[PDB]
Symmetry: C2
C-alpha cells in the first residue's frame, strides 16, 4: 500500500486504476446486466455478440471489453448453480 | 440500428456499445497518455506493468485497460508509416 518512488508515473497509474475499479463498481451496469433473463442467459448474450459481428463492427480495444462482459456472465452463472 | 425486435435486449447491448465507443471519444484521457515523455514511452509503461506483476495482484477489469492501453499505445507509435 504505502510506496512512492516515481510520483509522476504513479499519478498517471492512479487515475487509470480508479477508472478500472469504477468500471467494475458501476452499480448501474451491474443492475442492468443483472436483469439479463435467467431462462436464456446464453441467448441474450448471443444477441449482443451476433449483432456486433453482423454489422461488421470491430473497433480496437473493444474485443477485450467483451471479454470482461462475457467473463462476468459465465462466472455469475457459475457462482449460482 | 437497422432492424430490431427485442429493443430491451438491443438497448442493454447499446449501453455496452456506448461505453467502448464513448471511451474512445474521451480526448482528455488521450491527452493525459499523450503526455508520456518522448524519452522511450515504454519506460513509463514498464513502471506500471512491473508494479502490477511485482505485488502478484490482478484485480478483475484491470487487464482490459492494460491490453486496450498497451495495444493502442504500441500501434499508435508503430503507425509512423
Amino acid at each position: 500500500g504505502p510506496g512512492s518512488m516515481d510520483a509522476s508515473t504513479k499519478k498517471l497509474s492512479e487515475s487509470l486504476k480508479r477508472i478500472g475499479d469504477e468500471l467494475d463498481s458501476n452499480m448501474e451496469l451491474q443492475r442492468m446486466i443483472a436483469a439479463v433473463d435467467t431462462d436464456s442467459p446464453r441467448e441474450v448474450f448471443f444477441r449482443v455478440a451476433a449483432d456486433m459481428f453482423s454489422d461488421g463492427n470491430f473497433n480496437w480495444g473493444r474485443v477485450v471489453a467483451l471479454f470482461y462482459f462475457a467473463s462476468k456472465l459465465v462466472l455469475k452463472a457459475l457462482s449460482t448453480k
